[PDB]
Write a protein that binds this DNA or RNA. Structure first.
Ligand SMILES: [Mg+2]
Ligand SMILES: [Mg+2]
Ligand SMILES: [Mg+2]
Ligand SMILES: [Mg+2]
Ligand SMILES: [Mg+2]
Ligand SMILES: [Mg+2]
Ligand SMILES: [Mg+2]
Ligand SMILES: [Mg+2]
Ligand SMILES: [Mg+2]
Ligand SMILES: [Mg+2]
Ligand SMILES: [Mg+2]
Ligand SMILES: [Mg+2]
Ligand SMILES: [Mg+2]
Ligand SMILES: [Mg+2]
Ligand SMILES: [Mg+2]
Ligand SMILES: [Mg+2]
Ligand SMILES: [Mg+2]
Ligand SMILES: [Mg+2]
Ligand SMILES: [Mg+2]
Ligand SMILES: [Mg+2]
Ligand SMILES: [Mg+2]
Ligand SMILES: [Mg+2]
Ligand SMILES: [Mg+2]
Ligand SMILES: [Mg+2]
Lengths: 106, 46, 48, 377
RNA sequence: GAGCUACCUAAAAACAAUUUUAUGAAUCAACUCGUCUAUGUGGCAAAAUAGUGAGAAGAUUUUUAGGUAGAGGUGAAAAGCCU
RNA sequence: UCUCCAGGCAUACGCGUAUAACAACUCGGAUAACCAUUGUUAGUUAAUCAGAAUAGGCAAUAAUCACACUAUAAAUCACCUAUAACUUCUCUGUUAACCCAACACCGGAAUGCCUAAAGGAAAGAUCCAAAAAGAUAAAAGGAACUCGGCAAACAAGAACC
């Protein structure tokens, strides 16, 4: 199974292959983390709108940027915004990222 | 309208139609070359 | 060298040495204005 | 009380004075233009054949030529003149370098020539991201900043005039158009303007090199495409000023290749040419966003920084955009010249073996940290 | 001999503003065409010029390369076109 | 410097030195000045502009700001599985007022951007004749002109076969 592979049955086939049971909705532990206003970022709503506007219009000289340049930008921008919480939580300094990694199993 | 400008030069069109490789493709074209060599022509084709 | 055969090169071939060279070149006065370092030459058309 | 008509040239006459008055009429529309975007549109709506300046260029002595195109004086050294977690920053920088070469897999490249360049690009990209985050607690400005990778910075300006040498327009006056279209590897854009490195109008003994010949002698050709003044983001972007630029020298221009080509002196000239070209384009574009253009000289100098590397070595340059009035009409009696300060290249790390980076020099890391920590007043 | 022209294949490009609506509909440029009058008539022109007119999101126009050849080709048939 | 006109700069196809300076004043420009002409000398500088490894496996889901919205004419190598090779800058295009029309032809010529910041000059000097061509103005009348309201009009509205 590789990137381009498309399962005809969608989720159901994936469940059978990996022997997993599906629960709808994120874990309550994850959801409750952002319900606390202490985790809320300053000007969160405004900054997100700028990122969306930057992602789709302002980043390229052209008029209508193509999806080959604003789906990576939107995700990269948000991660570089969520990663601004190092000020509140110094523990976030213990992580780093990579690009186009290779994962395989048998 | 106004005639006289039928010739619309294109080097790709010219060489394909009356070129060396085009002439040699058929024996009827090779006999065009053979006669031209007999006469003494400066240019045997395009 | 010009008007001579260059041996065909395939993987692992020796280096090509031309002991006596047919390329003869001449230095000309620039037609336009050129930087002090720049120098103009007229060379055989087969020279790289 | 005789209301004489003004002693000015006719608008519609076919004369040099009449032509000049018509030019002033066009400039008037720019002056009265309501918004910056309309100002830029009026300036660049017409496209003429323009030299294409390349910040990363192999031409000999491109640095000196680029100064004349920009009127930038290169002064060697740094501009005239807290607690840091060096263990964390030093360890983090090593992690990015080591993680990439020793660890991580990806799919081994196909072309056998860009592998080292591809490896060099990723270490630079990752190191910048980590430092921005790791330096964020020390400087909160980076949190408000925007980090862009491989975005486009453009600037189109007029400097000098020439008489058309041949054709039907022989002898017609033609301005010399230059443009810079650049894609800096990494850049930081901040809303607030950075502090000045020197008071505006500061005079220095050094003078711009004057080139006898035309710009075509060093390989530099002309094309007619869209003129664009772009700061890496559109005018609507709240973040319009600049903080620092990261540039990667291409493989062809690396130290070893130049030595074999016998152009040893160009080892550092390559760095100077890119720094002058890119920073002027970035700072120059910023001024247009604030509304300043050639006739209306910038009241407040614009300052930006850049760091240029070949993968291993690093050199840092500082720039100040004293003037945009780089035209024959607007440069008649202009005593202000742009100032650029540069430092020699330093090797960040000698080489990597096993899981340790050999020959790591803290001085290079300290200088990078100082640039990132510079903040608006 | 299909670089003109009739037709076709493939790869492409152009179409503002306005009103309808959701279109081989409307007003009208670019653009395509060529109803009428006038001038010209060895003419600017071996078919043009000045006005006036028709279409202008479509059976649309245009570009590039290729194919069909005379006992033939092509033809929304004028015995029309094929330098 | 003044007066006035309003398709201009690039690209492609094409053309092939018509480019530029000097010198000539035979020829060419339908006349002169000047050269587009003659002779000699020069010229257009690119890793970015432009042009020129193998064997398998397998793709239901247009475009139009693609979200909503529907429709019908049903609509552009990649990614994997293995083998092979492990560090490069050569070559060619680049000039001009240019091409198809025997012509320095009121004709034909595709795309990009812009509409004067770019590009240009209708009159060699004279003169005010007839005829001819074009533009504008008209007392009274208003198609009485004519094959016909052709052309023109301060009109450009209505109905019919
Ligand atoms: Mg003929
Ligand atoms: Mg044709
Ligand atoms: Mg002019
Ligand atoms: Mg054809
Ligand atoms: Mg037909
Ligand atoms: Mg339309
Ligand atoms: Mg017709
Ligand atoms: Mg109509
Ligand atoms: Mg109609
Ligand atoms: Mg219609
Ligand atoms: Mg019939
Ligand atoms: Mg015939
Ligand atoms: Mg000449
Ligand atoms: Mg002369
Ligand atoms: Mg003539
Ligand atoms: Mg000559
Ligand atoms: Mg290229
Ligand atoms: Mg050219
Ligand atoms: Mg005249
Ligand atoms: Mg007269
Ligand atoms: Mg009248
Ligand atoms: Mg009358
Ligand atoms: Mg009657
Ligand atoms: Mg009538």
């Amino acid at each position: 199974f590789h990137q381009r592979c498309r399962l005809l049955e969608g989720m159901k086939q994936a469940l059978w292959l990996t022997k997993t049971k599906l629960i709808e909705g994120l874990p309550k532990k994850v959801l409750s983390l952002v319900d606390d206003p202490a985790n809320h970022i300053e000007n969160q709503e405004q900054r997100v709108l700028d990122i969306i506007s930057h992602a789709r219009l302002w980043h390229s000289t052209e008029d209508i940027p193509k999806r080959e340049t604003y789906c990576p930008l939107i995700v990269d921008s948000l991660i570089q915004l969520c990663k601004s919480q190092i000020l509140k939580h110094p523990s976030l300094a213990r992580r780093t990222s990579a690009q186009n990694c290779t994962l395989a199993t048998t | 309208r106004a005639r006289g400008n039928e010739y619309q030069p294109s080097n790709i069109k010219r060489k394909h139609k009356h070129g060396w490789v085009r002439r040699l493709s058929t024996p009827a074209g090779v006999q065009v070359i053979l006669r031209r060599m007999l006469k003494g022509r400066k240019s045997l084709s395009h | 060298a010009r008007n001579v055969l260059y041996p065909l090169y395939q993987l692992g071939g020796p280096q090509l040495r031309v002991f006596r060279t047919n390329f003869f070149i001449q230095l000309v006065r620039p037609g336009t204005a050129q930087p002090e370092d720049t120098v103009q030459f007229r060379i055989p058309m087969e020279m790289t | 009380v005789a209301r004489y008509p003004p002693i000015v040239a006719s608008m519609t006459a076919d004369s040099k004075a009449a032509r000049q008055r018509r030019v002033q009429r066009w400039q008037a529309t720019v002056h009265a233009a309501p918004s910056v975007d309309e100002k830029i549109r009026i300036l660049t709506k017409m496209q003429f054949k323009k030299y294409v300046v390349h910040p990363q260029i192999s031409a000999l002595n491109a640095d000196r030529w680029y100064q004349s195109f920009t009127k930038t004086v290169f002064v060697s050294g740094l501009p005239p003149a807290p607690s840091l977690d060096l263990a964390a920053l030093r360890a983090a920088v090593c992690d990015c370098i080591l993680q990439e070469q020793v660890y991580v897999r990806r799919r081994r490249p196909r072309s056998l020539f860009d592998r080292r360049q591809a490896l060099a690009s990723s270490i630079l990209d990752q190191v910048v991201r980590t430092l921005v985050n790791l330096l964020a607690p020390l400087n909160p400005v980076l949190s408000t900043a925007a980090l862009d990778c491989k975005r486009s910075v453009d600037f189109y300006w007029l400097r000098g005039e020439e008489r058309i040498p041949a054709g039907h327009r022989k002898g017609h006056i033609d301005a010399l158009r230059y443009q810079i279209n650049d894609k800096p590897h990494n850049q930081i854009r901040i809303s607030k303007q950075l502090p000045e490195f020197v008071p505006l109008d500061y005079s220095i003994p050094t003078e711009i090199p004057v080139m006898k010949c035309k710009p075509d002698k060093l390989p530099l050709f002309r094309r007619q495409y869209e003129n664009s003044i772009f700061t890496g983001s559109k005018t609507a972007d709240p973040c319009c000023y600049g903080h620092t630029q990261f540039h990667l020298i291409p493989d062809r221009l690396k130290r070893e290749r130049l030595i074999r080509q016998n152009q040893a002196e160009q080892v550092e000239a390559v760095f100077r040419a890119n720094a002058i070209a890119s920073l002027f384009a970035w700072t120059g574009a910023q001024a247009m966003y604030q509304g300043f253009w050639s006739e209306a000289d910038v009241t407040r100098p614009f300052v930006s920084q850049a760091v240029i590397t070949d993968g291993k070595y690093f050199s840092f340059f500082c720039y100040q955009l004293n003037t945009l009035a780089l035209t024959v009409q607007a440069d008649q009696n202009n005593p202000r010249k742009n100032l650029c300060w540069g430092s020699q290249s330093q090797p960040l790390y000698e080489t990597v073996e096993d899981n340790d980076v050999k020959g790591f020099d803290d001085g290079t890391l300290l200088q990078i940290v100082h640039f990132l920590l510079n903040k608006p007043r």
